[PDB]
């Protein structure tokens with residue numbers, strides 16, 4: 103029922119983890135391989151291993167989560183070697199995804215060059231939206247710098263590339279970004295990264311709940327679904343059909359999944375809910391989506407993909 | 414206990430309606446005068462009467478609300494005549510607030526000139542953030558256009574003036590806005606307006622729930638409190654102390670109010686929760702805040718105003 107075609111590859115279902123969640127180590131990644139997730143993605147990496155921010159840096163909230171992780175990761179070479187060894191095994195339906203989040207333009211170009219030069223045959227996600235690193239202002243909110251970076255990347259990177267974007271809140275912003283992105287042979291857009299720089303407060307202790315950045319953190323979960331869906335939808339009606347969409351934000355039930363697919367997402371990523379529940383989420387949410395499809399008499403995602411009705 | 418000083422005026426308590434909610438007509442306004450609200454503000458006005466967007470344009474949600482009202486209002490002259498008559502009566506503790514949201518810069522300047530020339534002795538709120546007018550961006554996301562408008566305004570406007578701002582999501586945006594705003598004799602900043610251009614979907618009808626703008630609308634309520642607190646707090650630590658703060662977003666309980674005051678808000682505005690509950694909300698929330706204060710042994714808002722603790 104959930105069979106999906108994306109970036110010219112076949113996946114059993116559209117569900118994945120969101121980058122940063124359950125994908126730090128090889129052991130995390132193999133747990134995702136073993137789960138019912140249709141695909142999976144690595145933790146965003148930098149050239150060097152990073153410890154990340156001081157703890158506490160992630161807190162579960164009734165309506166989602168807050169975090170300032172600071173891009174803790176085991177480094178580019180570790181993920182690159184894991185994905186190379188795993189594509190030789192031919193042990194999964196569909197390629198692995200590989201996230202990079204360089205602390206500078208030059209660092210992104212350097213990682214993209216190592217990926218190009220390698221035998222890596224899966225998909226790359228360039229994170230232009232990391233909101234938890236104190237001194238890098240979300241690059242995808244800087245339309246000039248975003249265009250300049252992408253022009254350089256496409257003079258050499260021929261492999262499948264998507265960009266993870268932060269949320270936009272203004273229709274003109276969607277128009278500007280779509281005109282930038284539509285000029286490139288991009289494989290996809292992934293909307294959205296966390297709602298940036300929110301605050302959660304413990305009113306008894308009169309205090310913030312994370313240590314870094316005076317408690318300011320990326321917000322995820324049910325808080326953000328309205329923004330997430332809007333971002334997926336707004337890009338769906340503006341992007342050239344060659345650029346497909348991964349929908350991320352607020353997905354916990356099959357009904358949430360259903361709503362993202364109705365907006366025009368082809369793959370779906372689960373952050374906060376996967377953090378809380380672990381990889382058994384995939385089996386649950388697949389079954390919820392299938393039941394919604396069965397009640398409606400739908401046998402494939404194409405029956406409703408992108409078919410959100412206006413009034 | 415809740416006695417508050419703001420813009421050199423005394424109010425019995427910090428609570429207000431948010432503009433747009435329960436303030437369209439004289440009758441609405443008089444209902445707010447009659448309630449326990451410490452103060453009240455008019456519906457954002459334009460030079461001409463406006464019908465607003467087609468219906469449905471406001472929907473209650475479990476986690477807040479979505480709307481694309483389109484600035485329906487009875488016109489500038491109606492609100493100006495109402496407030497002029499009202500200040501003559503000396504029938505309330507503290508001045509009325511008067512919101513304007515011109516469809517252009519020239520319209521805002523024309524209204525501010527009429528206010529300046531009038532005997533209006535209360536407080537004006539310039540809305541630089543309406544996210545529901547078709548074809549018209551949020552001006553306060555345009556830092557050059559915001560600065561240029563405010564420089565013109567302060568060559569003539571000497572009466573108390575605040576600006577209603579949309580939410581920002583990037584620390585560098587806070588710094589840029591604070592350097593702009595700190596160069597002016599502003600009375601206040603009101604953070605935040607709705608989270609712009611979110612989407613809500615009815616999964617059974619496979620449809621959006623508001624008619625204008627293909628269902629895209631300003632998000633309010635519990636969804637936005639983390640953003641709203643963050644914006645209140647980020648401006649508190651960056652604005653020169655002559656510019657005070659009104660906190661708006663996600664206030665429904667005394668605990669939500671307490672959280673805003675802890676961040677540094679002096680007045681508090683209630684939108685979505687007042688829309689659902691009516692003006693009886695003010696009595697309830699005042700009592701909830703006082704009980705929180707009593708449990709903590711606090712006798713005045715200055716015992717915790719702005720005292721949010723970092724880790």
Ligand SMILES: Cc1cc2nc3c(=O)[nH]c(=O)nc-3n(C[C@H](O)[C@H](O)[C@H](O)COP(=O)(O)O)c2cc1C
Pocket residue numbers: 120121122123145146160167169171173201203229266294295296321322323324326350351352353371372373374375377
């Ligand atoms: C623990 C934490 C770490 C994250 N790290 C990354 C990151 O490495 N790179 C990235 O692109 N997104 C990162 N994300 C953002 C998620 O990929 C996702 O966009 C966001 O959490 C919203 O989805 P959700 O509502 O299901 O949580 C992280 C999210 C969280 C919760």
Ligand SMILES: Cc1cc2nc3c(=O)[nH]c(=O)nc-3n(C[C@H](O)[C@H](O)[C@H](O)COP(=O)(O)O)c2cc1C
Pocket residue numbers: 431432433434456457471478480482484512514540577605606607632633634635637661662663664682683684685686688
């Ligand atoms: C029905 C509706 C109409 C609104 N109209 C205005 C408006 O005229 N001017 C304005 O500055 N804000 C307007 N707002 C935004 C609110 O003032 C407020 O900033 C927003 O609702 C967030 O607060 P809340 O979370 O308590 O709803 C409106 C909100 C709603 C719900």
Ligand SMILES: O=C(O)c1cc(O)cc(O)c1
Pocket residue numbers: 433457480481482483484485540542543544545546606607631632
């Ligand atoms: O369309 C309006 O009247 C309206 C105006 C605002 O400034 C915010 C909002 O959420 C709605």
Ligand SMILES: [Mg+2]
Pocket residue numbers: 134135136137138139
């Ligand atoms: Mg599997």
Ligand SMILES: [Mg+2]
Pocket residue numbers: 445446447448449450
């Ligand atoms: Mg009263």
